[PDB]
Design a protein around this ligand. Structure first.
Ligand SMILES: O=C(O)c1ccc(OCc2c(-c3c(Cl)cccc3C(F)(F)F)noc2-c2cn[nH]c2)cc1
Length: 242
């Protein structure tokens, strides 16, 4: 079924376009819009816990857009609730981290944060310089790929739809969706002469490690200074918060 695979491509790309938060052309056009030294100092002088509150809410919103992305993938809603949650819990943050490279400018090592670009020194008050370096380095490695929007869409669909996540109840069902998405992805890369990015994708385990460190830090902050979540997905909220 040739056009069926081209269908799933069009349905993944449309779900991505509807949930990607900012258009790539907006992010690229804003690259010259950079925080001043005075603006950077204002961020650096904020409380740890205020910068935590800002970052936690940006990350919560980002996760919620990823959940909406997943929900709009043909086949995801047909999975059982348990498996939907298993996949989102394990992979939604991984997708957020991947999505970050669109907002990263490798020319000057800045990210688009709250309306302008700035470097990692913007986040000094968080006292997480190791994790922030690891996030910036990761986005720096991905930015070298010059990911197109469809490549990020199909790749992040596969970050989510991974039949190897422990605890799946209907594994064959997740496998079917996974194989169809893998075919869609490989067909698209062939069509665009972009198969060369396959060897350049992050090693399996690299994204897992960075996300587990990231989520562990967020859980520590949340334990010390809980934020109020505008909760839209009760079964998933219940798995992350306590
Ligand atoms: O609207 C809903 O109902 C809703 C919204 C977000 C949800 O979780 C966000 C999240 C966080 C996070 C974030 Cl973003 C910010 C602060 C603290 C955490 C913590 F404490 F959980 F670590 N970290 O990891 C995830 C995650 C990984 N996979 N899925 C989610 C869940 C449900």
């Amino acid at each position: 079924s040739l056009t069926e695979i081209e269908h799933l491509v069009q349905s993944v790309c449309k779900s991505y376009r509807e949930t990607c938060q900012l258009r790539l052309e907006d992010l690229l056009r804003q690259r010259s819009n950079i925080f001043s030294r005075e603006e950077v100092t204002g961020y650096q002088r904020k409380s740890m816990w205020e910068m935590w509150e800002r970052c936690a809410h940006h990350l919560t919103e980002a996760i919620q857009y990823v959940v909406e992305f997943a929900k709009r993938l043909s086949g995801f809603m047909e999975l059982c609730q348990n498996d939907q949650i298993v996949l989102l819990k394990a992979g939604a943050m991984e997708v957020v981290l991947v999505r970050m490279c669109r907002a990263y400018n490798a020319d000057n090592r800045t990210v688009f944060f709250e309306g302008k670009y700035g470097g990692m020194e913007l986040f000094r008050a968080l006292g997480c310089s190791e994790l922030i370096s690891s996030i910036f380095d990761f986005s720096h490695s991905l930015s070298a790929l010059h990911f197109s929007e469809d490549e990020i869409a199909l790749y992040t669909a596969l970050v989510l739809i991974n039949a190897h996540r422990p605890g799946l109840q209907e594994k064959r069902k997740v496998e079917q969706l996974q194989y169809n998405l893998e075919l869609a992805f490989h067909h698209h890369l062939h069509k665009t002469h972009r198969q060369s990015i396959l060897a350049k994708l992050p090693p399996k385990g690299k994204l897992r490690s960075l996300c587990s460190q990231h989520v562990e830090r967020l859980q520590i902050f949340q334990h010390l200074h809980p934020i109020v979540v505008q909760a839209a997905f009760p079964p998933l909220y219940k798995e992350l918060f306590s």
